[PDB]
Structure 1
Amino acid sequence: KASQSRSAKAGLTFPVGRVHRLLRRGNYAQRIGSGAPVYLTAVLEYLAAEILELAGNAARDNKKTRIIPRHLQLAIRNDDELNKLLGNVTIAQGGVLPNIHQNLLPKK
């Protein structure tokens, strides 16, 4: 009779039921369908997985084993759809990508 959660029924590692809870008493709608938390959970799965991929490659690119917010900042700002989505948010302790204008160089 005992069966496990809906997250592995959908094959996901994020909690489906917690997302369903937050959608229920988040007063967005008076009635919430069954398939909505699964879809939202899968979208959050792919977004978090892609952000962790870019952060892991950034941390490999600096020869470290830990995720610094510099790695998150360079991974977000280097890539362009993450630039468009996250243009208006300032990452805490992120810094600024190096850029020099061509006319400001010592051209000679």
Structure 2
Amino acid sequence: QSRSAKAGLTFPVGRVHRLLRRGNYAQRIGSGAPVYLTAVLEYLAAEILELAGNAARDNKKTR
């Protein structure tokens, strides 16, 4: 099983971590950076999607 499931995170911690590793950012990356990044992206995406869905539903649309 992946850490995202045991941490209840929808976004992939492993994918973010491997993006950071090959993203020429720092040679040493702690385990907290990928989980923090996944959490913040999940929060931002959730808020944006909720607002967009509100804007869609107030215009008689389901998309």
Q: TM-score range, shorter-chain basis? A: over 0.9
The structure 1 segments of at least 4 consecutive aligned residues displaced by more than 6 Å after TM superposition are none
What is the aligned length? Answer: 62
Q: Distance in 1 between matches of 2:43 and 2:50?
A: 10
Show structure 2 runs of 5+ residues with no match: none
TM-score norm. by structure 1 comes to 0.56
> Alignment partner of 1:17: what SS?
helix
Instruction: Name the one with the larger helix percent.
Output: 2
Q: Which has the larger radius of gyration?
A: 1
Q: Kindly indicate whether structure 1 or structure 2 has the higher relative contact order, using CA contacts under 8 Å at least 6 residues apart.
A: 2
Q: Distance in 2 between matches of 1:46 and 1:34?
A: 19
Q: Distance in 1 between matches of 2:50 and 2:13?
A: 22
Show structure 1 runs of 5+ residues with no match: 66-108
Percent of aligned positions that are identical: 100
What is the Cα-based RMSD across aligned positions, in Å?
Answer: 0.6
